[PDB]
């Protein structure tokens with residue numbers, strides 16, 4: 318059986334500067350030999366090309382999702398931005414029902430969310446769209462419950478977002494701040510119910526300090542040395558009439574982990590973290606589904622992904638292996654399969670344990686040799702059509718911000734890559750060698766401090782098939798179409814990426 322493999326060098330991209338660039342400073346004789354001999358191009362793994370905002374660096378979860386899907390998979394922020402841009406947002410059934418509940422009861426609309434442009438849990442421009450929709454639908458009383466950031470944006474920036482929102486309320490003639498809470502209190506994720514109870518109490522006008530304005534309470538916090546994240550929940554005098562029977566809530570956070578808890582206080586009947594009398598006839602809407610114990614209407618429902626690469630393999634009676642060490646094992650399984658844990662028919666998996674160290678600069682080779690030897694063992698069975706392999710090292714070591722260890726990591730990977738790819742070519746197969754976003758290409762700021770993040774740099778592609786020419790750019794959603802091309806399997810319509818091999 319002739320194998321085709323996708324080899325993902327996690328966090329390994331193309332960057333012109335050599336300064337702090339472990340990719341260029343490493344000795345990688347195997348990669349270079351394949352690169353110089355075989356067809357090559359580079360593809361985008363950041364921003365709009367992988368369903369993120371312009372300028373946002375890629376990541377492993379988003380990367381491997383796009384890779385397995387063979388299409389652009391839009392993440393929540395971009396999905397919601399586009400819904401607002403094209404107008405579908407203003408017609409959303411769930412938001413209009415929430416509003417119809419408030420209008421018909423002559424009650425109040427509350428809005429909860431992280432008030433910043435951090436873009437990890439929320440975006441405050443989504444609040445402004447809610448305000449415009451509420452105003453378009455004639456809603457009379459809108460209360461905004463601000464949760465302050467300081468963590469996905471500068472640690473003391475809350476005043477700027479508050480000011481711009483105040484000017485929004487004025488411009489639209491609608492809405493007011495009713496309570497203000499640091500994300501420490503309103504967006505805890507460790508079951509610290511005592512912290513949540515303070516934010517709940519301020520939201521519900523039950524028990525909290527009061528200030529005349531949102532600015533005033535924030536400045537007071539700052540004066541006591543307490544920054545945005547840790548602002549103690551407070552009520553805005555004369556601007557909070559409680560959460561009462563018949564009201565609605567719209568929570569605009571789209572990231573589940575830190576919104577779930579507050580949402581259980583209000584809309585999980587079974588909640589017992591502390592004693593509550595829950596609001597009766599409360600229409601509770603969440604921008605995404607935060608968990609299964611919240612009785613909520615879901616504004617943006619999860620979209621299941623049909624015909625990922627694994628499903629197409631199954632449906633052509635192919636066999637496949639997913640293989641990586643711990644740190645990227647969910648990526649080559651769950652995320653690769655479009656957010657699905659169940660194995661496809663014909664799918665087998667190999668998990669290799671990562672070393673247990675706090676940071677991987679302490680063992681740059683990680684478990685890459687064990688991964689390679691597991692893969693050799695699988696290939697020697699001769700029964701694999703498709704292999705999806707990830708070498709974790711360049712990402713996981715590069716996160717250390719240390720250049721020599723990150724070089725050593727790439728070098729170990731290069732030794733493994735040689736053994737793997739030579740075996741595949743030995744078996745008359747094909748490898749696509751590539752990455753899911755950058756990181757290791759830059760481990761030092763330009764002034765020589767540690768840099769510990771992913772990059773927005775494009776990623777290399779090597780396809781080990783002779784006499785062929787690759788397209789000059791593309792995106793991660795083109796990799797799976799390239800695998801099907803190599804396997805001579807038909808590509809279905811809902812895979813909208815395009816093979817990198819020119820025809």
Ligand SMILES: O=C(O)[C@@H](CO)OP(=O)(O)O
Nearest residue numbers: 435437438468469574575
């Ligand atoms: O703590 C969180 O909520 C985010 C930062 O907003 O960090 P991470 O994605 O690492 O959990």
Ligand SMILES: [Mn+2]
Nearest residue numbers: 327376377753
């Ligand atoms: Mn990655």
Ligand SMILES: [Mn+2]
Nearest residue numbers: 328377712771
């Ligand atoms: Mn990473």
